[PDB]
């Protein structure tokens, strides 16, 4: 219940019973997905090569 | 940390009381709102980005509403007074090796099987009094347990004299024999200490221990050397790190469940609890049931957290505003 | 000096970045006691009388909600005084107060010095009635840590 | 002697994948946390109910 | 040769200079921090370390049995102690004194 | 400068300075990792702590 | 907010000024240390995890040292006063459509080639005066610009009554002309607004603008109906969102460069700048030269920020502590 | 300058000249590496299943 | 003497250490001393401007800085960006003996 | 008319990899950022001086 190295920023975590999405993101098991096919180029008429 | 829930738990910070919706100007404000026919209670709170409200409590459907102080959520650091057994020998026997083991039980992981053993030792000599023993074994324990190289704080050890009898003189791994100058030391006190805490990632957790003694040869038998009794605690870990880790969890209920997962792309929720202040906690635990054949209940709880100044000024004014508005008899703490 | 250092192998990296790994631990816990209260709410001092006389209800405050509805939990003296929980926890902040009982045929209660701060409690099981039993017991989870190094 | 256990999950956890920022572990019968690689959350709930 | 001793003295007798906030505490000539990481002897002495004044077999046998009863199996309790020439004579006198009893 | 005693090159196409001296520069990066420090046991005399 | 560097730049928040190393007890303390020969200057400060000293400044090798007040670093929001062109007509000519094109130039993208336009339109009536024009023009502008469900606010609209002439009458999309009852309106003020801000991830940026007018058929002539002049600014964006970004960058030159990246496997740095408080900045720019042939300079700077309340109390005491220790002549703001 | 939705995390960043390791670390192009074969199991004698 | 990370001076009877080097005392890696310049000379004595390495906030004791403490070289750590030159090398010489009839 | 340019990078940027938390973009002559999959920081420095 302490630290093994100097830079141990995580502690062992535990809970009981019904598990929420809040319980899963706090144990770092929920992350937003990247839509890799989705890419946005901002619309403009570029005139730098003019 | 991660807590258990009775199907939900949502937390609101009561930094101030404004008594109507139009006075919500700074963040952290709270207004206990209800109607005249006391059927609905809710809390309009000023978030860091606008006015927000809570779920509308049906006042026939509350189960309990009891508020706890900040003195009831403070972990008391356990003490152990290590002395010489006068039945074995009142003075140290002039030849033996006097060894004391500290049996830690929640070293780095959660279980009682992740143990750790630290030691102090004194070779007793002729003419050594009982006070010069405790001067020499609090030095030996401090070089092992309060060293500068250890990854975690393990125990705080102190010496108590027979003249003072209450005041602790702290002995560290840098403390010398010439600093501890008293001929009336009568015990050694080994006290738990507070472990480090990182907000939401490393919870508040403690390493318990047990001072254990080895056997010295007195006459012809190996008698255990000493006796250790639990002394009533004098130091408590304050409430701030438990509540700051309690806002941080219950903020994910009304918000983003991933707090920092994937970091160019996070939604920085701003928290209102100071980790360096003590807080009072009020829990209204209610449910929902409809007028139909679906008569089962969906239990819910709403936590309100206000600062404690020692006389509970902010929470009792928060409790009293709920009592007039909603007609609930929350007990003044 | 190098003959000391040549007993350790070399592991080869791609860049001079900080690196991290997973530290995995253990799971079998027990929970200390905070304070014990009798049925009218008075905190059980060490010099008090017996607390669970005639299977009377009384309360155990714990620093966390680790226990469940119908479970039998035992103190330092396992199976001598078994405490069966009655109902879910009432959360007094970060403090789960369980209304418990005394199983095992115990008539004259549990002594007051067996209900002090630092007394450790672990889960035995959750016994139910044979006819019209309602759901008891619950299920618990754990999670690991990590460590780090540099150049 | 008749015993009973109970666990409740939300219906959101039917196919809930675990984006493991830290690895997800199983509690063994021995007491050891063993590292696991299945990404579904109900694989870990069914381990602890049994 | 001097660059060879620099590499070996840093791999064993190296000491980290970073805070618990993450900041380094020694800055170079260009102002950037000197990011020193620890060595063999500093990274390994942060746990399981005993500082004794006089050595006894009652100390070391109890230090190695409470360790091994908690962590190791029965057939796994072989301990190869790395020491010096004077630590072997200090070892020899204690297991002479135990066997003489 | 003009000559390099480290190599033996008398004459310089690309001079660094005019002092007629020679400086050698070396650099290296290194590291040591100890995974678990609870798996090494040590007994040290008390005069070596400080 | 990434900035440029000449070489490495370090920042130290001065939350309290002490006089000894021993007095450094809280996170944010500072003390300027020097010799009695004044040949080396460094800043000992209290980090959130202990005492940390700064680099050693050679007092012969300083280039400049200057202290910047808070009002020098406060962005003045640009105001534009839209009136009817008196040469065209001082009253609205009946039956003509009065369209105004606000040309935004640094909308969401980072260049002048990413542009955006918001319109406002008024068709004039038979008895419409100048004030009734400015009322309906600002109602139409705020209806288009300040809708609630836009992505970001762009500009603020303010009528001015000619009797008041110095108090801004705020016009929003919820504003009706039943609320705007004054009969002497002489201009429409359009003023840019402060964009959102996340520390490190989103810098402090502004979207500039110009009002442009479409032509009306006055007397058979297509004349553009109005003029838009830039009046003196009356609002300022405070310094706090700029210094917290200046600390978030300069805490990777001391601390961790990996901020958040593999999210639970990070070191988390504690930042001592409150982003809702103004600061004054002191830049001590200095260099290092080697012994014989290493004569190239390593030109670096040490930043110090002190929170200031109106009159610059904490910075002028910081400079006064540096000037008596270093022997420098930093001017006091 | 501005946002394209309600939830945009980043604003565009820019700098001139000398790039340092925090110039890359403030544009999220410097991350620690997961050493997957390095893994620490904490030592204990596990007396569950006994 | 090295509270915070403060400079202090170490006087040696010869110039044996170099700029930027880590040198250690009798308790070698507990207090590592970093050379912060060149050895400004005082006769044969060479005084060294010195600050402490490691995470040493507490300082170095005054009984670890007395006459007779045996110092040795460790290494010369340098920063990752815009590093500048540190360190040096050392040389020795033999002796002779004679006999007669 | 005669002109000049300069740009200094540190020595440690020789084989400095980019960790790609965001995409790494490259400014074009036309005034448009285009995203690039080159892993080296010197690929983006050498485009800018050109
Ligand atoms: Mg060790």
Swiss-Prot record, chains A, H:
UniProt subcellular location: Virion
General function of this protein: Capsid protein self-assembles to form an icosahedral capsid, with a T=9 symmetry, about 77 nm in diameter. Each asymmetric capsid nonamer is covered by 9 capsid auxiliary protein, 1 copy of the trimeric head fiber protein and 2 copies of the dimeric head fiber protein.
Assembly mode: Interacts with the auxiliary capsid protein (via FD region). Interacts with the head fiber dimeric protein. Interacts with the head fiber trimeric protein. Interacts with the portal vertex auxiliary protein.
Note: Displays an HK-97-like fold with an insertion domain that protrudes at the capsid surface.
Name of protein: Major capsid protein
Parent-record interval covered: 2 to 51 of 504
Swiss-Prot record, chains B, G:
Function: Auxiliary capsid protein that forms an outer layer on the major capsid protein protrusions.
Name this polypeptide is given: Auxiliary capsid protein
Keywords, ordered alphabetically: Capsid decoration protein, Capsid protein, Virion
Major localisation: virion
Annotated spans, FD: 75-237
Subunit structure: Interacts (via FD region) with the major capsid protein.
Domain remark from Swiss-Prot or TrEMBL: The central region FD is structurally similar to Helicobacter pylori flagellar cap protein FliD.
Keyword Acyltransferase: no
Species in which this protein is naturally found: Bacteroides phage crAss001 (Bacteroides phage PhiCrAss001)
Example of a GO cellular component annotation carried by this entry: viral capsid, decoration
Cellular location(s): Virion
